Structure formats: C-alpha cells, structure tokens
Scaffold this active site. Structure first.
Site, PDB file in Angstrom:
ATOM      1  N   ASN A  62      -7.559   9.150  -5.411  1.00 19.00           N
ATOM      2  CA  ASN A  62      -8.057   8.375  -6.163  1.00 19.00           C
ATOM      3  C   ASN A  62      -8.948   9.406  -7.497  1.00 19.00           C
ATOM      4  OD1 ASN A  62      -7.734   6.277  -4.415  1.00 19.00           O
ATOM      5  ND2 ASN A  62      -8.482   7.291  -3.349  1.00 19.00           N
ATOM      6  N   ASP A  91     -15.437  -3.059   9.389  1.00 21.88           N
ATOM      7  CA  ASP A  91     -16.797  -2.105   9.288  1.00 21.88           C
ATOM      8  C   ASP A  91     -17.759  -3.242   8.113  1.00 21.88           C
ATOM      9  OD1 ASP A  91     -17.871   0.582   9.323  1.00 21.88           O
ATOM     10  OD2 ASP A  91     -17.556   0.704   7.294  1.00 21.88           O
ATOM     11  N   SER A 111     -10.983  11.133  -3.811  1.00 23.57           N
ATOM     12  CA  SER A 111     -10.244  11.016  -2.326  1.00 23.57           C
ATOM     13  C   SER A 111      -9.586  10.708  -2.307  1.00 23.57           C
ATOM     14  CB  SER A 111     -11.407   9.965  -1.518  1.00 23.57           C
ATOM     15  OG  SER A 111     -10.791   9.195  -2.731  1.00 23.57           O
ATOM     16  N   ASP A 163     -12.373   9.747  -7.423  1.00 24.54           N
ATOM     17  CA  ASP A 163     -13.740   9.406  -7.044  1.00 24.54           C
ATOM     18  C   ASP A 163     -13.017  11.242  -6.421  1.00 24.54           C
ATOM     19  OD1 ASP A 163     -12.248   8.806  -4.835  1.00 24.54           O
ATOM     20  OD2 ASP A 163     -14.136   7.809  -4.218  1.00 24.54           O
ATOM     21  N   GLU A 194       0.752  -0.990  -0.110  1.00 22.20           N
ATOM     22  CA  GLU A 194      -0.333  -0.010  -0.357  1.00 22.20           C
ATOM     23  C   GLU A 194       0.936   1.475  -0.517  1.00 22.20           C
ATOM     24  OE1 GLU A 194      -3.157   0.181  -0.826  1.00 22.20           O
ATOM     25  OE2 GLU A 194      -4.713  -0.910  -0.346  1.00 22.20           O
TER      26      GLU A 194
END
Ligand SMILES: CC(=O)N[C@@H]1[C@@H](O)[C@H](O[C@@H]2O[C@H](CO)[C@@H](O[C@@H]3O[C@H](CO)[C@@H](O)[C@H](O)[C@H]3NC(C)=O)[C@H](O)[C@H]2NC(C)=O)[C@@H](CO)O[C@H]1O
Ligand code: NA
Length: 129
Positions: free
Chosen positions: A46, A101, A50, A48, A35
């Site tokens: 990103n 989550d 973010s 989108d 990562e």
C-alpha cells in the site's frame, strides 16, 4: 497455492466462514477472488507503507506483523508470512477477527467495491458443499 473456486469454498466453510457475522460463503469466495485471485501467496504494497498478505489480503498496519510498517498493530498476533501458507487457517482466523472489529466485510476494499450487494451466491455454484 492457487485454489480452485470450490476448493476454497470448501476450505472456508470448514474453517467456519460460512455465515460468520452474517456473511454467506459466496461473500468470502467473492472477496478472495477479487482480493488475491485465489492465490495464497498474493502480496500487495500500500502507499501508506503497509502490505496486504494472502488470499484475503490482510493488512500489516493493523492485523499482522511484517516488521516494516512503523506504528502498526498486530491485532491477530501473527507474522504476516503466516498468512501466506497453503493452509488458509491463519488467514481465516484473522479475517474473523477483522470482520468483527466494527465495519464488517467493508474491511476488504475489493469486497466493498466488487462483491457487496451482488449475487454472491454465484460464487459457490456447483460446489459439493
Ligand atoms: C482486510 C484488511 O486488512 N483491511 C484493512 C482494514 O482493516 C483497514 O481499515 C481500518 O481498520 C481498522 C481496524 O478495523 C479500523 O479501526 C476501527 O474503527 C472502527 C470505527 O470505524 C472502530 O469500531 C474500532 O474501534 C477501530 N478498531 C481499532 C482497533 O481501532 C479503521 O477505522 C479502518 N479504516 C477505515 C478507513 O475504515 C484499512 C486501512 O488501514 O486497510 C485495509 O486494507
Ligand atoms: Na505490526
């Protein structure tokens, strides 16, 4: 800070990631390797809008607030910059929230695509853990 493999393994274990939600330490070290390359300062935008922050590339759409992701949640209640410290405490607390989550470590695309199902124990080899 660029962590060494065993330095990050020991920090993650001290922060209680070893076996959290059933994910062995090698899973977390592998996920961080792919990562962020063990770089606490890693940031990646990103499409989108973010941004992913820190050693475990935590996303600003859901987990932290960076002030530039309209319609985003901050479920870890933390500025995204707090996920970049040389101290990985905050990233780990938030990763614990993330992995609980619903989809576990599949939340980390690099973990799903590069760590999942492999011999992740190789990642803690040689560490005085
Ligand atoms: C490490 C990181 O930040 N990874 C990011 C992912 O977290 C993110 O995936 C989306 O995450 C949210 C929160 O986990 C998912 O919402 C949950 O969805 C499940 C059902 O799938 C449900 O149990 C939960 O109620 C729900 N939680 C909330 C608070 O609504 C969402 O479904 C995930 N999306 C996908 C496609 O899996 C992705 C996308 O933003 O980015 C990663 O970087
Ligand atoms: Na936010």
């Amino acid at each position: 800070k660029v962590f060494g493999r065993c330095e990050l393994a020991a920090a993650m274990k001290r922060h209680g990631l070893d076996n959290y939600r059933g994910y062995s330490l090698g899973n977390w070290v592998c996920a961080a390797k792919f990562e962020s390359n063990f770089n606490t300062q890693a940031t990646n935008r990103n499409t989108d809008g973010s941004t992913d922050y820190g050693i475990l590339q935590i996303n600003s759409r859901w987990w932290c607030n960076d002030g530039r992701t309209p319609g985003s949640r901050n479920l870890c209640n933390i500025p995204c910059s707090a996920l970049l410290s040389s101290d990985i405490t905050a990233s780990v607390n938030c990763a614990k929230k993330i992995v609980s989550d619903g989809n576990g470590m599949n939340a980390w695309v690099a973990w799903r695509n590069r760590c999942k199902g492999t011999d992740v124990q190789a990642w803690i080899r040689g560490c005085r853990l």
